[PDB]
């Protein structure tokens, strides 16, 4: 009467065991089994220094690929106030608003391959190819690993990086509307996705949800405003939301947000104090002696980086929101270099709490559509 939907899990985000009753074709009750990917970072996080712990974050974080280092650098640099310049802050803003894209693609593409869009799977990978070159040439191998040191960042991104957005920077803009005209076309696209897994706003805030999946009910709880994160807020933007919260609302809110990414990028590349990197490159040779360059502004590193630094009792929380969902790393402010206790608060662990309450009296196909639209991944969940 009950069968598991397979630990092999013929889905996007890895391994998920779903034990569910089956009355021939329709289901009555389903249950998830989690815990199969225990990265156990909460253990090692005490028996390590900072720099040896730096590449650890983009390991259980390879879909987001960047939304783990924001808070992982907040604790070392933003807590003890090792003053981060506003230019390096704008560089980090470029990073974060490109990771918004890194998430939008790696959801919508697979979301297209879950909803019923059979062809565009390779299309979005062909679009994403350029972000690979960017992440490679910026700091690291493929996921740009080790782009956040403590006193700033690893190294200012090279010259062929910042001023060279233009190709994808105006390509994807005209490319967005492709998906918007394709989704409203062939209502078989739309018929199966409309009117499934609907959720309200009061339960969206009562269940602890977050992200565009929650913003899609007129909640607009977008945490890209509530925090003076590295004094980023000089830029302008446009809140992305909807007023339903269901799967189609999820698609709408996650297709209407990436248009702001390149907008913020355009704000930065010309609004960064250094602007492009070749600009600051050709400017630090005529005024090598002294200027606002290399001062509290225009400096990648403030003080020496090293695995030696003591801490006081200061247990600070940040609810840094990713387009998948919120994230937080609370930690008992300890007097020792490495602290007593570590903690993570991922969106995946705060998303599936409604999962068994989502698929109610539905069919297997309905479960497939809801689980493809919910924008969920493992890695973040287990930690």
């Amino acid at each position: 009467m009950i069968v598991n939907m397979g630990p092999q899990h013929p889905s996007m985000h890895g391994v998920l065991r779903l034990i569910v009753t089956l009355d021939g074709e329709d289901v009555i009750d389903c249950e998830p089994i989690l815990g199969y990917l225990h990265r156990g970072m909460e253990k090692i996080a005490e028996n390590r220094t900072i720099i040896q712990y730096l590449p650890y974050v983009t390991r259980w974080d390879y879909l987001a690929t960047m939304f783990t280092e924001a808070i992982t650098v907040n604790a070392p640099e933003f807590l003890e106030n090792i003053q981060i310049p506003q230019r390096a802050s704008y560089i980090r803003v470029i990073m974060l608003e490109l990771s918004r894209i890194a998430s939008h693609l790696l959801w919508l593409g697979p979301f297209m391959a879950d909803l019923g869009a059979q062809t565009p799977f390779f299309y979005i990978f062909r679009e994403r190819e350029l972000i690979y070159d960017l992440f490679e040439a910026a700091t690291g191998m493929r996921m740009m690993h080790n782009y956040f040191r403590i006193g700033g960042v690893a190294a200012d991104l090279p010259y062929g990086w910042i001023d060279k957005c233009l190709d994808f920077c105006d390509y994807f803009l005209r490319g967005v509307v492709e998906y918007q005209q394709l989704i409203t076309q062939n209502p078989i696209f739309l018929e199966r996705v409309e009117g499934v897994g609907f959720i309200s706003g009061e339960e969206a805030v009562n269940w602890g949800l977050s992200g565009p999946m929650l913003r899609a009910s007129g909640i607009q709880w977008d945490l890209r405003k509530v925090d003076p994160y590295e004094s980023y807020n000089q830029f302008d933007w446009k809140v992305q939301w909807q007023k339903e919260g269901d799967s189609l609302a999820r698609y709408l809110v996650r297709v209407g947000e990436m248009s702001e990414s390149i907008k913020i990028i355009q704000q930065a590349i010309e609004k960064i104090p250094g602007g492009p990197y070749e600009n600051l490159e050709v400017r630090r040779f005529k005024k090598e002696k002294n200027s606002e360059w290399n001062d509290f502004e225009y400096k990648f590193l403030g003080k020496k980086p090293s695995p030696n630094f003591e801490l006081s009792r200061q247990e600070l929380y940040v609810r840094v929101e990713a387009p998948k969902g919120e994230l937080g790393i609370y930690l008992v402010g300890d007097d020792s270099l490495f602290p007593w206790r570590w903690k993570i608060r991922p969106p995946g662990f705060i998303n599936l709490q409604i999962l068994p309450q989502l698929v109610k009296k539905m069919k297997l196909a309905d479960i497939m559509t809801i689980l493809g639209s919910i924008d969920i991944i493992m890695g973040e969940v287990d930690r």
Partner: protein, 194 residues
């Protein structure tokens, strides 16, 4: 004064086969290696780039790599992503439930040793070969998206290194032992209800 010496080759390995009965299995194994199909599996920090192996950056489907999402059908599985203690007691079922010409390999340096999960943690398993016999170990976390194709090319020769008499080294015996228990049963814990 050698420790743990290797067993002696029992057979003299002295035989000669006819070409009209050998080239058959030769080309058969040539097809068996030149028509391999992947089996879908991917979990963690050494997997994601496998997807890029289907697009315009890397295309291993150019060689007929038909990705099958079923154990009993396919023969090539990539243990991508770092494996932990769990999800393994059901992983090996896959290797147990596919035809014999498997010749499985590894992928991800965190699967040959458990690299970035090897200081102190009661979850990660030290390598994969302590769970399943595979042939090639692939480095990289993430694994180099080109090194996997090169290792596939490497393994592509081992099958071509097979003969007609080699189609007997997959037959099994049974060391089935007759030993009972005396303990108390435990009812099912994974109760599927909300």
């Amino acid at each position: 004064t050698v420790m743990n010496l290797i067993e002696f080759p029992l057979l003299d390995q002295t035989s000669s086969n006819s070409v009209i009965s050998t080239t058959l299995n030769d080309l058969s194994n040539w097809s068996r290696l030149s028509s391999l199909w992947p089996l879908l599996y991917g979990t963690s920090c050494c997997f994601i780039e496998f997807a890029s192996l289907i697009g315009s950056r890397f295309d291993f489907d150019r060689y007929g790599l038909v990705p099958r999402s079923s154990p009993r059908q396919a023969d090539l599985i990539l243990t991508a992503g770092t494996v932990t203690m769990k999800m393994a007691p059901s992983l090996v079922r896959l290797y147990e439930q596919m035809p014999e010409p498997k010749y499985v390999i590894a992928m991800g340096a965190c699967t040959i040793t458990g690299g970035m999960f090897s200081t102190d943690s009661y979850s990660t398993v030290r390598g994969v070969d302590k769970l399943i016999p595979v042939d090639v170990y692939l480095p990289g976390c993430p694994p180099k998206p080109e090194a996997v194709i090169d290792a596939l090319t490497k393994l592509r020769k081992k099958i071509s290194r097979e003969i007609v008499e080699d189609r007997t080294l997959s037959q099994n015996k049974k060391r089935c032992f007759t030993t009972s228990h005396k303990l108390y049963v435990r009812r099912s814990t994974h109760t599927g209800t909300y």
